[PDB]
A paper describes a structure:
As such, we found that a circularly permuted variant of a cage-forming enzyme, [name] [name], cpAaLS, assembles into a variety of hollow spherical and cylindrical structures in response to changes in ionic strength. Cryogenic electron microscopy revealed that these structures are composed entirely of pentameric subunits, and the dramatic cage-to-tube transformation is attributed to the moderately hindered 3-fold symmetry interaction and the imparted torsion angle of the building blocks, where both mechanisms are mediated by an α-helix domain that is untethered from the native position by circular permutation. While the wild-type protein, AaLS-wt, self-assembles into a ∼ 16 nm dodecahedral structure composed of 60 identical monomers,35 the negatively supercharged variants AaLS-neg and AaLS-13 adopt expanded 360- and 720-mer assemblies, respectively, constructed entirely from pentameric capsomers. Moreover, a circularly permuted variant of AaLS, cpAaLS(119), forms not only ∼24 nm and ∼28 nm expanded spherical cages, but also straight ∼24 nm-wide tubes of variable length. We previously designed two circularly permuted variants of AaLS and confirmed that their morphologies depend on the positions of the newly generated N- and C-termini. The native terminal amino acids were connected via an octapeptide linker using genetic fusion and new sequence termini were introduced either between residues 84 and 85 or 119 and 120, yielding cpAaLS(84) or cpAaLS(119), respectively.
Author numbering:
A (entry chain D), G (entry chain AC): 16 to 162
B (entry chain C): 3 to 162
C (entry chain EA): 5 to 162
D (entry chain IA), E (entry chain FA), F (entry chain BC): 14 to 162
The structure:
Amino acid sequence: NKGWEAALSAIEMANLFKSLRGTGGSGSSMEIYEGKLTAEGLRFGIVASRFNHALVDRLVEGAIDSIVRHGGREEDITLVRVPGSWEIPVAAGELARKEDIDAVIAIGVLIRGCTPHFDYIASEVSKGLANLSLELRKPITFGVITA
Amino acid sequence: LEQAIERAGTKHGNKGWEAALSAIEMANLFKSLRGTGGSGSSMEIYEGKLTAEGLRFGIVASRFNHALVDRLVEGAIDSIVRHGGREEDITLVRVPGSWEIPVAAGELARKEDIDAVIAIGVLIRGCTPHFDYIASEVSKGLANLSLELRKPITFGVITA
Amino acid sequence: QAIERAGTKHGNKGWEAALSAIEMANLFKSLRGTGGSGSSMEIYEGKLTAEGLRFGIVASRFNHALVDRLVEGAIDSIVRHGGREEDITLVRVPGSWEIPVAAGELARKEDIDAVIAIGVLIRGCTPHFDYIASEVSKGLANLSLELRKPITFGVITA
Amino acid sequence: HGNKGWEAALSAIEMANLFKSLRGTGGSGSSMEIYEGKLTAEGLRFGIVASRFNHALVDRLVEGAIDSIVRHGGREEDITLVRVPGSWEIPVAAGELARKEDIDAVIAIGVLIRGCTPHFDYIASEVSKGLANLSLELRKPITFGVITA
Amino acid sequence: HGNKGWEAALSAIEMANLFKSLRGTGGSGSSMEIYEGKLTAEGLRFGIVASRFNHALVDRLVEGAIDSIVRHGGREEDITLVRVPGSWEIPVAAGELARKEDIDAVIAIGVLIRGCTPHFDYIASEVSKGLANLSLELRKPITFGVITA
Amino acid sequence: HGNKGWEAALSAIEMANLFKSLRGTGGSGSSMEIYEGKLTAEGLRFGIVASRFNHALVDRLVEGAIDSIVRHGGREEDITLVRVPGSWEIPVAAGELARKEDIDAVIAIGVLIRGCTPHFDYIASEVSKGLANLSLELRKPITFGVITA
Amino acid sequence: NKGWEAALSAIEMANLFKSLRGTGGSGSSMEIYEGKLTAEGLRFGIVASRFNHALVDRLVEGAIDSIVRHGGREEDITLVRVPGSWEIPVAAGELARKEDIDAVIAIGVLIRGCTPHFDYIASEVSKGLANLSLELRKPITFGVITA
């Protein structure tokens, strides 16, 4: 289930970035940054598509299940629904600008990966999410699949 | 007789119907997002309504294959008034070709009186494995406008 | 319960059955009014606006785990298209045998514009003729013609 | 407890309560009204129609019908029993009990036979078709519980 | 001409003129009376009900019906058209249209699934049963132009 | 009310009463003794094992398990809930609860998956085989209720 | 990677069984048992086969990676190698009888699953592991795959 794997990367990004904003050691050793797999006290946001109802729904349940079993709280989860895969970048950008949310998870399904014609739609979904992560300085997980 | 045959045709299944349908949901979704938050004690779920009343839309269409692109526009026109949108709140802009769709949609999206933008066009020689430059730029141009202006733009284009 | 809420409900038979009820409740309202200008062909088409409309839903409690998905899909489609949650009447019956008789009482009220029937059917070991499955379709069809009121019919076979 | 007579009986009590509240007083808004029948059988009258064919099986289903009613609060004075020679005659007998204003629900019990071919059985088709039409015309619940031998 | 919309349309005109002769006075006698319908659509008001399902096939049949009437002298103003989502609720829409005194004939167009793997269909039979039963009650001719896939 | 969780729960109460009377005082002749469990759940302790796979369905069955017990006279203080990641781990968890002398019955709830071929599913075969062997060795009832997706 | 999933079940069995050996609440509510996803202070044992070197090796690396990233310590991991899939039940039983080890993970690869002939070998691998879990009262994870 890609939903479990994509959600799991979101916990260890909030912890890693929280250590970055803090203060490291006073030298005397090789300073190292590391994120732990605890979702306590973290806020998440989930954006999922509507196309391919049979496939998308099971991926969403993994996202919530990953957070709650890893020590998270279901009260801090926000879910946004979009019509198609084209509307994920615009919806994720609006959701990520909120100060309360720490990470954004994107879920979707792609219908083809063996032709340049459909690569026009598929490329901009990944391209838009990548630009938002660098611009907003907030982690965004790319958890869509293809079939 | 010809006026009856063309008008009796149905525009429910064309891509113009789907493109206009997605714009209505996204327009209401952002209105709820920018509003006040929930009361807590439960997981928040956001979803847009399909009430098209009180919403303004813009449509950009190309001139290539005018016998085919016009019926796609009429499907988009039907969907807006289908769910309760007034016919006076829609704007129509025509462009000579698919290359200049992004630049035309930029002017409409910057207006404060427009809530969503729907783009309709047709491509040529889609049966080739070679990369197409004009087809890639029109798809890339609309994507960047939506992220910069924070306004949803719907992309519906078919290939011959 | 949020996991159940997170499950998508668009596109099922409950969504489709409730969609037709909204259109016909507005289509019949247009026929109740005066005629057109008489300048060309007079084509009618019901609207998808559900503002101020009233609906009734008949559901079978059999297969309680699966019937709720279709019931909630019909409820969602009413609200999602502008309808009010206060104008929905829901009744529940044990099996598909009692769906026609329950739908008749709701359809006879003057405060109801459309009636939606939701249920599931049993598939046997062989594709033989089913008396129970054939009778429920006939009962709802006869009620709509008699009562001058459109009743939608969405069921699936297990 | 698990025979079809018990299951057919249980639908009779809950329908009598459901139709009682449906035509009673109205709601008051502020929520969606939910109508569901109660399993209490107090103050209800019932009628039972049974066929004489396969007397060994039928007597078992009939005994379960009264047992289910009395267990859920019913009274043996209110129930009425009618016996018919065969399955073809159940619709005409059930109509007489349903037209009485002192009867709240009608329960039909019978045993069917396997036909020669998978084609439509005319006797089997008419008994189910006739009972359903009586319920719609008379606006009274009618329970249809049969077992094919 | 080669589609069922052509055939189902012309039956409406000749049946409509046939009913006009019967409503009038009798003949002069002295011979056998033969009542005949005419292929003249002048002065006739019709109604068309079509289903939105299978957009590719239905629209070709609808325009065929419009082509047939105008070719045989039909007038464009009198044509009335109603669209329905599916084939399940065709007769109920025709019921509201056939009971108008201004309407003389009703044409129904629809498309059903292939099926044929079971012994019966629970949808294709009901739409045909509803239209035939409705015509007898209203004493108004309603044609049947529904084609299976 | 009709889910498999309710049906699986009901067997737990009646077995605890049946095994209580079976090893209790003896009979006195003059007839054949008949032993049957009573549906009263008062004074009984239960243990529930549920799998995390398909959390949407499992939470519905689990809620029916407690609801059936408390309705028939049970008390929510006596019931014990244990959750396992999957169906393969149900036998080992059920054995720990059954070895406790404070537990009268053990209820197992899980959801299975369809295999690729009609051949034996090793995961599905061992979960049913393991639970049955625990009941015979420990002389304690164990209820096996699962649904294949 | 089935190695990540099979190893993950081992952490939540040691925590769950540790709560069983303790003492629950003094009533007043519905008593519930639950295991958490923390591998701190736990000991594990891994048994892996030798056949199909290209497939087995990547599954083993997931087993150690699952433990260390979830808060575990690599000093407590014990690994045993066996020639074929037939020798997993006998090796696991010897390893599980040690008092220090809390959980046992089995890794292997099966070559066929669509014939009764090879089902003789495959059934006894699963049958033997199931009996050891009930007899020794110690969790054993069934993490083999088929190809």
